[PDB]
Every structure is written in structure tokens, then in C-alpha cells.
């Protein structure tokens, strides 16, 4: 009747794969990506600014 | 007015750049796992 049980009837897994053969999609704060990104680019840029200035003498 | 007499110029040689880049990346590698948690 209603197709509400149709998607339920899909017991065979139908979804884009997780990074692991045993499935890897865990609850990690996505703020970690931004925090890691900012912690890398901001001090890296600071060092590159000082080095390129020095290298140019 | 007259220019400031305390003017200095910051320096960073290449070996300091490599140390600085290594520290930032090594420290990120260390703390990334905990920040993601």
C-alpha cells in the first residue's frame, strides 16, 4: 500500500560507502577541521611573511 | 614629525622557517586527534 515500508524494505544497504570497510562516519566536531585549518594557515603565513622579507634582504 | 628612532627590522632565516613550519605541523598532528575527539 503506502510506500512508507518500501524504504524500510531496503534492508540491503544502499548508500554511498563510508571510508572504512567496516564503515567510518563517527561524531567528530567539524569545528576540528576549521580549528586545524586556522592553526596551520595563520602561523604558516606569519612565518612566510617574515622569511620572504628576510630572504629579499 | 621627525621619524621614530626606535625603528627595527624583524628577521627570520630559512632554518627558522623550517623549525617554525615543523612546530606548527607537528603540533597540529598532535592536537588534531583531540580537537576532533
Amino acid at each position: 500500500x503506502x510506500x512508507x515500508x518500501x524504504x524500510x524494505x531496503x534492508x540491503x544497504x544502499x548508500x554511498x560507502x563510508x571510508x572504512x570497510x567496516x564503515x567510518x562516519x563517527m561524531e567528530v566536531n567539524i569545528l576540528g577541521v576549521i580549528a586545524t585549518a586556522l592553526f596551520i594557515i595563520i602561523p604558516t603565513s606569519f612565518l612566510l611573511i617574515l622569511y620572504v622579507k628576510t630572504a629579499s634582504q | 614629525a621627525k621619524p621614530n628612532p626606535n625603528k627595527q627590522s624583524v628577521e627570520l632565516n630559512r632554518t627558522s622557517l623550517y623549525w617554525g613550519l615543523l612546530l606548527i605541523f607537528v603540533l597540529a598532528v598532535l592536537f588534531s586527534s583531540y580537537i576532533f575527539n
Binding site: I30 | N13, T15, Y18, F25, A28
Partner: peptide, 30 residues
């Protein structure tokens, strides 16, 4: 995402090692 960020951090750190060895400031006498 984490697995991608861990790999970039690791290979990024390895990339710095390569440059620090071959593209280093040469030590010159006097």
C-alpha cells in the same frame, strides 16, 4: 573528513622534511 585531514597533516609534515634537507640554507665558511 578526519581521515583526509590526518593524511594531509602527515604528508604535509613529511613534505617539510624533504625541503629542510635538500632546499636548506647551505652552511658557508666565513
Amino acid at each position: 573528513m578526519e581521515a583526509l585531514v590526518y593524511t594531509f597533516l602527515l604528508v604535509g609534515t613529511l613534505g617539510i622534511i624533504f625541503f629542510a634537507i635538500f632546499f636548506r640554507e647551505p652552511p658557508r665558511i666565513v
